[PDB]
């Protein structure tokens, strides 16, 4: 997944310097400097949230285990409920007839 | 006798709540160093947008004329 | 790995373009843009590197990383809320422990013999 | 009905009652961080 | 290199003289720590887990002259809250093997390496 | 009883020993199934120790 937002975000970043790129001689120049910077500023941002993505990249594994972990404890606590519910069930249909 | 239709006990040694599975794994060394972001931003300020524009923007993911815009751009 | 260096590579370059843009540019300013495009090749190689990886993310890591979050607290909470959940079930199961307890001790004082019989039997 | 086995019926069965009930209010409530 | 005199200044002075601490000075980090290099810092921890006291101090100062300007204002700021934490550790009362008085002149052999008095003179000033 | 229902107890029918010790054998396998939650809740062997409760109720 990381991949393809990678791939994605390229591409996005290619349109708009495209985009940039054929609209800078129709924009004056000086604020096609200020566009310019605010493009740059923008794929900076691109840039640094993908170097967030890949430092968390390393970390997917701990999150992984944590939410397997978590499974198993709510497996376990689902079936202590349907115990109890069993036994109320049990104990108050059953039993009257 | 003997008692009716006794069943087998399970395992002594099968996977429980009580058991701590993150030492298990080795992932409790990681939380004691871990135990930024607004902590790192709190600390600071207690001892003593276009972000969110572009917040959506990333969730979904010629030479000549850059000559002449870096030349007149300098004004 | 060196889809984190290219990436890294290619936002210095493209801070380095953006401050010469800022300024007033007097050698040829198409290197910064020739600097712009090998960072988006290289971004491009990066992305084709995890592709064959093959490395899956979820998106709520996008808007904590939009709030700015570090991965490592991330991790904090995964942590935190897996150690809280197993204290949560061994305190449920050291009630039980009790609570059975109790239960082995009134059922001995109140009915002696049945239970020294199943305390035979196992 | 209303002999002494109809009160043995619903003792036993209101003390599996006391017995979730005591489970359900010591799991709703208690103390929540102490380190009632 | 800053780093390991930051390593000269941190696990053979703070801890004071604890073996497994110093091996495991960048390793206690091991989440903050270079990880393909944590165990190549490992190889050479090992060797210094016991501190060694290092008396010359111009060979830094030689070797500075080839680094970067930013760093000796790094090493007066990497000793200045480091021997604070050893002098409150000292009122406070487990640091009862400070870093003696050879270590101490090898402190004042470094701040003239650019005469950075103004960030030397309040360090002094809470020091005395 | 002796159709749809299996049969644990013989024939000799000590009527209120039967009680108490269906009263007996239902408290020690509660408590037997509290172990049962306690170590694994999340095992196969569960239902057959309910279906043996229940045997013990009918």
């Known amino acids: ?97 | 006798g003997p008692f009716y239709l006794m069943r087998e006990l399970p395992g002594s040694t099968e996977l429980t709540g009580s058991t701590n599975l993150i030492t298990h794994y080795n992932l409790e060394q990681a939380y004691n160093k871990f135990c930024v972001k607004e902590k790192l931003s709190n600390f600071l300020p207690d001892l003593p947008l276009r972000s969110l524009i572009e917040k959506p923007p990333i969730l979904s993911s010629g030479t000549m004329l850059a000559g002449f815009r870096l030349h007149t751009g300098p004004l | 790995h060196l889809e984190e260096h290219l990436e890294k590579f290619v936002e210095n370059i493209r801070q380095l373009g953006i401050i010469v843009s800022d300024f007033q540019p007097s050698s040829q300013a198409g290197l910064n843009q020739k600097l712009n495009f090998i960072v988006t090749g290289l971004q491009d190689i990066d992305k084709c590197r995890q592709q064959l990886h093959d490395i899956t993310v979820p998106l709520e890591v996008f808007e904590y990383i939009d709030q700015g979050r570090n991965p490592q607290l991330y991790t904090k909470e995964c942590l935190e809320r897996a150690l809280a959940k197993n204290e949560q079930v061994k305190g449920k199961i050291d009630t039980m422990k009790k609570f059975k307890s109790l239960l082995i001790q009134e059922l001995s004082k109140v009915f002696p013999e049945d239970m020294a019989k199943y305390r035979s039997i196992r | 009905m209303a002999d002494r086995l109809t009160q043995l019926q619903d003792a036993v069965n209101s003390l599996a009652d006391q017995f979730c009930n005591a489970i359900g209010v010591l799991q709703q409530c208690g103390p929540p961080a102490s380190f009632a | 290199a800053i780093k390991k005199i930051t390593k000269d200044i941190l696990k053979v002075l703070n801890r004071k003289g604890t073996a497994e601490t110093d091996q495991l000075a960048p390793i206690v980090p091991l989440n903050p720590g270079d990880l393909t290099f944590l165990g190549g810092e490992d190889g050479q921890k090992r060797r210094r887990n016991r501190p060694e006291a290092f008396p010359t101090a111009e060979d830094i100062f030689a070797k500075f002259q080839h680094l970067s300007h930013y760093d000796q204002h790094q090493v007066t700021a990497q000793v200045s809250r480091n021997v604070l934490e050893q002098i409150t550790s000292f009122a406070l009362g487990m640091s009862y093997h400070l870093p003696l008085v050879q270590h101490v002149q090898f402190i004042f052999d470094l701040m003239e390496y650019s005469l950075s008095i103004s960030g030397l003179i309040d360090f002094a000033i809470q020091l005395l | 009883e002796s159709q749809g229902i299996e049969r644990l107890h013989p024939m000799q029918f000590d009527h209120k020993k039967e009680l108490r010790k269906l009263n007996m054998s239902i408290l020690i396998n509660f408590l037997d199934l509290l172990d049962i939650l306690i170590r694994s809740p999340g095992s196969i062997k569960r239902e057959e120790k309910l279906e043996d409760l229940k045997l013990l109720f009918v």
């Open chain 1, 1 to 97: 997944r990381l991949s393809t937002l990678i791939e994605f975000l390229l591409h996005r970043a290619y349109s708009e310097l495209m985009v940039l790129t054929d609209l800078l001689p129709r924009k004056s120049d000086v604020e096609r400097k200020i566009e310019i910077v605010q493009f740059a500023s923008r794929t900076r941002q691109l840039f640094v949230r993908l170097l967030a993505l890949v430092k968390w990249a390393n970390n997917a594994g701990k999150v992984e285990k944590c939410a397997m972990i978590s499974s198993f404890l709510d497996q376990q606590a689902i079936l202590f409920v349907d115990t109890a519910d069993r036994l109320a069930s049990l104990a108050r249909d059953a039993l009257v007839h």
